[PDB]
């Protein structure tokens, strides 16, 4: 079954920011980058399997890429998706 490998692949990298730290310290949530699709059920299952923690609900959003001009040539950064996984009273990382 490729469910496990898909769950491993959906998670790409965490997101670090002042808002992320505030959310972690107050609301007990971790914000991390996810795959382009990264459906809620799949990301929740991947978090449960990998971080061996318990979560309440997961909501995600799409961040539109910025258009930057390198030299005289324009270019739009690739779109990336971020998900906020809310941990329960018991969290480890």
């Amino acid at each position: 079954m490729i469910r496990e490998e898909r769950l491993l692949k959906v998670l790409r990298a965490p997101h670090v920011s002042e808002k992320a730290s505030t959310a972690m310290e107050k609301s007990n949530t971790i914000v991390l980058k996810v795959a382009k699709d990264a459906t809620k059920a799949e990301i929740k299952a991947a978090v449960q399997k990998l971080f061996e923690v318990e979560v309440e609900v997961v909501n995600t959003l799409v961040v539109k890429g910025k258009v930057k001009r390198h030299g005289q040539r324009i270019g739009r950064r690739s779109d990336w998706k971020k998900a906020y996984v809310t941990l329960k009273e018991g969290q480890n990382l």
Partner: protein, 63 residues
């Protein structure tokens, strides 16, 4: 390291693929994202190994 797993059975090579996908890949990407990874060739090596294992699995299973 290309013919070491060529003679391995389907189940054991699938288990090796699962191990490569889980360990040495998720941890490496997390370390790279956090900035704690000092060496980057490990990501390329593990990706190439996973691709080779997948190719061997496709060649063996089925045809």
């Amino acid at each position: 390291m290309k013919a070491k797993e060529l003679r391995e059975k389907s189940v054991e090579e699938l288990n090796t693929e699962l191990l490569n996908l889980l360990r040495e890949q998720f941890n490496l990407r997390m370390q790279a994202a956090s900035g704690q990874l000092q060496q980057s060739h490990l990501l390329k090596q593990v990706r190439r190994d996973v691709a080779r294992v997948k190719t061997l699995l496709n060649e063996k299973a089925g045809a």
